[PDB]
């Protein structure tokens, strides 16, 4: 059984820069009476199926930009991208097909871009959900960078750190920003018990917390 290891586990680079990631196998992938390296590189963009980029260590698959270059022999291999495009965002894997087939742990490529403050939106519960005894308050924080962000909920001034669901989207292939959803679920009764609801966010992009809120009273 051949083990594959890749480094870095992840890195971030800005558009236009060159990038190099390596792959190591515990055993040589160079077949003696053949002179071929049984290694391949795959790329997997978020939500998509993986795609073959390189095989035989250096043969580029047709339809693969010349930006990608595969080198190495034996136990050491590298994948290089001359000028990174925002569309190159994805996880890269190397696979050995010498003895069975095994994939390395993969290298995650992120894109570095200019900082961007998030656009925040808060939503009261649906009249339909309330008619069912539930009450979920939602807050969206879209198109921001870097990914690091702090969100806290407040109800009538009191913060709530229990019953909050948060989800981050993968970096956007177009603008390279991140978006996030934060849902606070309560019972209709607890919801009808209070008046003010607040979604408060802290991002390095501002020295002041971005706040959004509403009062159940209004319509």
């Amino acid at each position: 059984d051949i083990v594959m290891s890749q480094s870095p586990s992840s890195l971030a680079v800005s558009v236009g820069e060159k990038v190099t990631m390596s792959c190591k196998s515990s055993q040589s992938l160079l077949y003696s009476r053949n002179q071929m390296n049984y290694l391949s590189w795959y790329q997997q963009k978020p939500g998509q199926s993986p795609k073959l980029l390189i095989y035989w260590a250096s043969t580029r698959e047709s339809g693969v930009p010349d930006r990608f270059t595969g080198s190495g022999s034996g136990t050491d291999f590298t994948l290089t991208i001359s000028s990174v495009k925002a569309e190159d965002l994805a996880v890269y894997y190397c696979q050995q097909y010498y003895h069975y087939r095994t994939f390395g742990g993969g290298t995650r490529l992120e894109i570095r871009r200019a900082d961007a403050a998030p656009t925040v939106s808060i939503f009261p519960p649906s009249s339909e959900q309330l008619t069912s005894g539930g009450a979920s308050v939602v807050c969206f924080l879209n198109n921001f960078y870097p990914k690091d962000i702090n969100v806290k909920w407040k109800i009538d001034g009191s913060e709530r750190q229990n019953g909050v669901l948060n989800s981050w989207t993968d970096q956007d292939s177009k603008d390279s920003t991140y978006s996030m959803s934060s849902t606070l679920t309560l019972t209709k009764d607890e919801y009808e018990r209070h008046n003010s609801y607040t979604c408060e966010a802290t991002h390095k992009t501002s020295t002041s917390p971005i706040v959004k809120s509403f009062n159940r009273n209004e319509c």
Binding site: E61, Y93, P124, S126, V138, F140, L165, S167, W168, T169
Partner: protein, 219 residues
Amino acid sequence: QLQQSGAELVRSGASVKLSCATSDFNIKDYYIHWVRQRPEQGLEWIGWLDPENGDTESAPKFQGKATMTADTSSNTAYLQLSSLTSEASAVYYCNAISTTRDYYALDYWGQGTSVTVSSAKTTPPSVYPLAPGSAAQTNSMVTLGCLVKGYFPEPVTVTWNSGSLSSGVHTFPAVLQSDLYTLSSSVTVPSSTWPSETVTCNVAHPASSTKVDKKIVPR
């Protein structure tokens, strides 16, 4: 272009039958490989099948636990996984490879099949429209959302206006809370387009043949 069967929910200890078909070529001119990806996990090779003669091979890990067969009549490939455990919950891909054709290796991938191994029952989701609160029109851009709550298992598909609205759309990864999935999606359109024009989010939950269309109407 490869077509795979739909999401499957199977009971622990049961078995599953996965299909991979095509009509854009004879599956006899290819080798069929199955690959799986567990949540927040890397790629894992399972085995290959030569439709041409029925020859197959499985990774040690899947020995005598994964039957692979083919029906070249309907140009379909199958993969049977027996005595499934919770660990087998993942996204299964089929990959059709060929190098005997042209000076370049032919590489095709399926879209993937989500297999969830659990003792829980399928649960259709509740779709709630998220309209802005009174204060959200005195601006230029407006954000709307749909909350897809309490479903099982993954995945769900969400579109807006049947795909006519894609720019400005953000669909957040589902979060698991109390053995049920919750996911949300947002779309931002010009304040001049909504509410003047109708915005609808469409939700489909394969596992339960559930189809929902929920129009976003102002409060």
